[PDB]
């Protein structure tokens, strides 16, 4: 019944905090772990003393970020053995995350995962949170995913990748790191939700009304949308009740397993209808990955409503969009939109710039227009690899230069795989 | 893969698990390794309710496999009179030939399914159809001393 979450690099770790902050508010769980109040034990385990502990591992090749976890609001929530830190970071280098530094700590990390999996009876699989451009996030994750495909091979693994964006980008080589992990993590991931930090930036500047967002701003918005996807697993809905169903509903091709997530509504803290929010799911401005689905074919599409929702309003709003817009599907797909509803209201953080809304929706749709995002990375990659720029850093940390090309071909092949489906 | 679960379901005969798999959009005309559709498997192992469900959701009644076996071939071989009549009602090819040159009438005659022989005949089965060796269903009744089948073949 149980799902294990893993957080790799600052991105994973800090988005993790935002998600487990938000999970504990949605489940009425206290910062100390207590609860004055099952479906939610998919994510949490239980102590003999009435304390509810997350089924989570935090990993970073450097203390600073995870140190703030275990001296913060939720320091008591996690067991200290779950929070793992090295000393030398990967320094924005996939090679160090995967080869040089990652091998020094991979075994300790896999060991601490076994301790959480041993507590579980019918383990489903893994949720994995990590950046693309980060050295740890790219290199170590891809390594950990390889090794989880051995030590737990017969079960699911889901990604929550943070797609890079120059507005918050810390490194020049982030295209490299993105391509390198996506190549080596392609075969080992069953489904993967990309999060373009540019879209999250754009959304927070427009709909949250912030001049220069911070990471807290972006992570909170992101955690809201992650909660919307994992709500089906935490409250026992009708749709997407276990990790296999994500692949069944959204993945009709092992490789092409990258859904576009769209979330409405994002209301500043300074109500809409069911129809209004469902139209916003087909507005590009509210997507998590910047692309144009109008330029692409849908392989599948799920709608996860939560809150004050009448099942008939949904069917009206669906028929509205199925008639009054031209959402092109592939011919070999069930042309019907899958739906599920969870009547509990979207929780926000007390203090949050995001307002409590009466109802909300998160549309998960495996459109071929998301290939546009791969094209933007591949292009940036090509410019730098044309001059072998920054390549010596990678090659000097245990990586063969060939691996660059093998990865790029796998990304070129993936761009062809998206094309042939959509023609 | 939902097309492989539907193949397994139609074979093992889990009527509910066929309906469920079809409710998630499973491929009704999915082939296994040797080209066998779920209709092949349901008609082989005598699962009448699954046969009628697949036919009503757009299964190719005349789908062949790697050996040219139609569902009517396999139903008449195993001796499923109920399914033979359902297949014919959905426009099955009574005189389909397979890689060995046999028609459904050949297989029902060899296995002694006299009631199915009579049904096939009344739907215009070709008594003069020959197999590879050159033998008709009537030749099979003569060569195998089967006077009950010889009589039903000339009725």
């Amino acid at each position: 019944r149980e799902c294990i979450s893993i957080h790799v690099g600052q991105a994973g770790v800090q988005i993790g905090n935002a998600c487990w902050e938000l999970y504990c508010l949605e489940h009425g769980i206290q910062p100390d772990g207590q609860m004055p109040s099952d479906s939610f034990n998919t994510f949490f385990s239980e102590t003999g003393a009435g304390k509810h502990v997350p089924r989570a591992v935090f990993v970073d090749l450097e203390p600073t970020v995870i140190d703030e976890v275990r001296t913060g609001t939720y320091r008591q929530l996690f067991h200290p053995e779950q929070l793992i830190t090295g000393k030398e970071d990967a320094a924005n280098n996939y090679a160090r995350g995967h080869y040089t530094i990652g091998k020094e700590i991979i075994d300790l990390v896999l060991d601490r995962i076994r301790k959480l999996a041993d507590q579980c009876t019918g383990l489903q699989g893994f949720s994995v949170f990590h950046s693309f451009g980060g050295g740890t996030g790219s290199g170590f994750t891809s390594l950990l995913m390889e090794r989880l495909s051995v030590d737990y091979g017969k079960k699911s693994k889901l990604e929550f990748s943070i797609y890079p964006a120059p507005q918050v980008s810390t490194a020049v080589v982030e295209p490299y790191n993105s391509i390198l992990t996506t190549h080596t993590t392609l075969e080992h991931s069953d489904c993967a939700f990309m999060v373009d930090n540019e879209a999250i930036y754009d959304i927070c500047r427009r709909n949250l009304d912030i001049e220069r967002p911070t990471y807290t701003n972006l992570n909170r918005l992101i955690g809201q949308i992650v909660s919307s996807i994992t709500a089906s697993l935490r409250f026992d809905g009708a749709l997407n009740v276990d990790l296999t169903e994500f692949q069944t509903n959204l993945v009709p091709y092992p490789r092409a397993h990258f859904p576009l997530a769209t979330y409405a509504p994002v209301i500043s803290a300074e109500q809409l209808s069911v129809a209004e929010i469902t139209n916003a799911c087909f507005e590009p401005a509210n997507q998590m990955v910047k692309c144009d689905p109008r330029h692409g074919k849908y392989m599948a599409c799920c709608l996860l409503y939560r809150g004050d929702v009448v099942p008939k309003d949904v069917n009206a709003a669906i028929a509205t969009i199925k008639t009054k817009r031209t959402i092109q599907f592939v011919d070999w797909c069930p042309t019907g939109f899958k739906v599920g509803i969870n009547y509990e209201p979207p929780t926000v953080v007390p203090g949050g710039d995001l307002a409590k809304v009466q109802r909300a929706v998160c549309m998960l749709s495996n459109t071929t227009a998301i290939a546009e995002a791969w094209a933007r990375l591949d292009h940036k990659f090509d410019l730098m690899y044309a001059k072998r720029a920054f390549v010596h850093w990678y090659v000097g940390e245990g990586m063969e230069e060939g691996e660059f090309s093998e990865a790029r071909e796998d990304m070129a092949a993936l761009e062809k795989d998206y094309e042939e489906v959509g023609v | 893969d939902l097309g492989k679960k539907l193949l397994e379901a139609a074979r093992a005969g889990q009527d509910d698990e066929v309906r469920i798999l079809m409710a998630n959009g499973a491929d009704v005309n999915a082939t296994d390794a040797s080209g066998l559709t779920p209709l092949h498997l349901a008609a082989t192992y005598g699962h009448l309710e699954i046969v009628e469900v697949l036919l009503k959701h757009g299964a190719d009644v005349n789908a062949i496999d790697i050996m040219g076996s139609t569902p009517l071939h396999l139903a008449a071989l195993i001796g499923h009179l109920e399914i033979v009549e359902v297949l014919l009602k959905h426009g099955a090819d009574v005189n389909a030939v397979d890689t060995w040159g046999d028609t459904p009438l050949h297989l029902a005659a060899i296995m002694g399914h006299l009631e199915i022989v009579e049904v096939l005949l009344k739907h215009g089965a070709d008594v003069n159809a020959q197999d590879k060796f050159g033998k008709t269903a009537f030749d099979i009744s003569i060569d195998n001393g089967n006077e009950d089948l010889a009589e039903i073949l000339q009725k």
């Binding site: 450097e62 000393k87 030398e88 320094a91 810390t170 020049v172 080589v173 730098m384 720029a389 | -």
Partner: protein, 424 residues
Amino acid sequence: MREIVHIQAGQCGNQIGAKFWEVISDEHGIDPTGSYHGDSDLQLERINVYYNVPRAILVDLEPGTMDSVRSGPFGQIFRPDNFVFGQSGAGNNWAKGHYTEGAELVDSVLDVVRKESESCDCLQGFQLTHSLGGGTGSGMGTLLISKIREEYPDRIMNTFSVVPSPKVSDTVVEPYNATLSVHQLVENTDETYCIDNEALYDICFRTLKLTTPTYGDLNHLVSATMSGVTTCLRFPGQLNADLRKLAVNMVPFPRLHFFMPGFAPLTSRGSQQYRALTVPELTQQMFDAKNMMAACDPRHGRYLTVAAVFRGRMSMKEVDEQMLNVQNKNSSYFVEWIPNNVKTAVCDIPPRGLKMSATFIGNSTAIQELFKRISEQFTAMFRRKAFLHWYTGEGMDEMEFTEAESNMNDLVSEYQQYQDATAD
């Protein structure tokens, strides 16, 4: 990636070195006795980087320099053991610093380096200040670097090397010494800030209108630059946080790691700055070649990578806008095949005596101009074979000069290649 071990070698090394410790001790709120009298946590957040008391080793063959440091303002704070000094001086002979006399002492220095590294939670790398036209700072410094490089290959090597210019010393052997030293730095250091005395004089003379600049005047510009480039390292911040990440986003090709630093606004020694600059004004001290600490014209080449550090309270929105502006309004000057090669970071704590400031670290191919000047002076000297008996007598071979000459010219050619490169 926490602690940094600092080294200063030779006269110049300990001069701009001590000046650097003066500047960042104030900024972090440390007095000469070594006690915190600040009033902010953003000051002691990453004090562990440069301090324990400085993590600084002082080196010179010239024993007099010992006292010039301790008799300075913050001279009391440095650990007595970390002073390592020879009996005689090198006398502008790179060979004496690298092979003979400087080599005799280098072991004693490595013993102290080891001692300071031994008690580090997690070392980042090293930081050496020195001049290149000297005998000790160049010859023994480069020998120290290699000796550390091989004893600590898992660490960064970061130098603040100052280039000789006839405008500051008429010694003609400096082209030899600096050429030999550049032949070392291109092979032995991950990143090197090129401090050009030619440019320091031209700034004190022409922009600051001082008819006779002293070392102190040139050293003021340097110490302020160093605190600027080390702002990311010393205060909390997302971007260019540690030495390795910096070099990762600054150095695309291992040999081309010579940064052209420059910062703004340019102030005199303790002058009054009534009018504080605006964000667009600071931003327009980047291409402004009168703010470069290296005597090169960024207009004459192309930027491979750029790091901008804005210090003070100001609009992060406006800085982003101005930087995004100045990049695309001069798009032909930034290399196209490295996307998002310019990176900007802000620190709220301004430098001493200024309300706002901005430092501009750039890997510009124009730096080839600097290496051109050194090589032409080297070749003019070397073709007449002047003063070679100094170096050869100390065990050097005439061949070495040819190799260093050729190797610097390869370094110039490489910069010229990537300048003329195209994305197409």
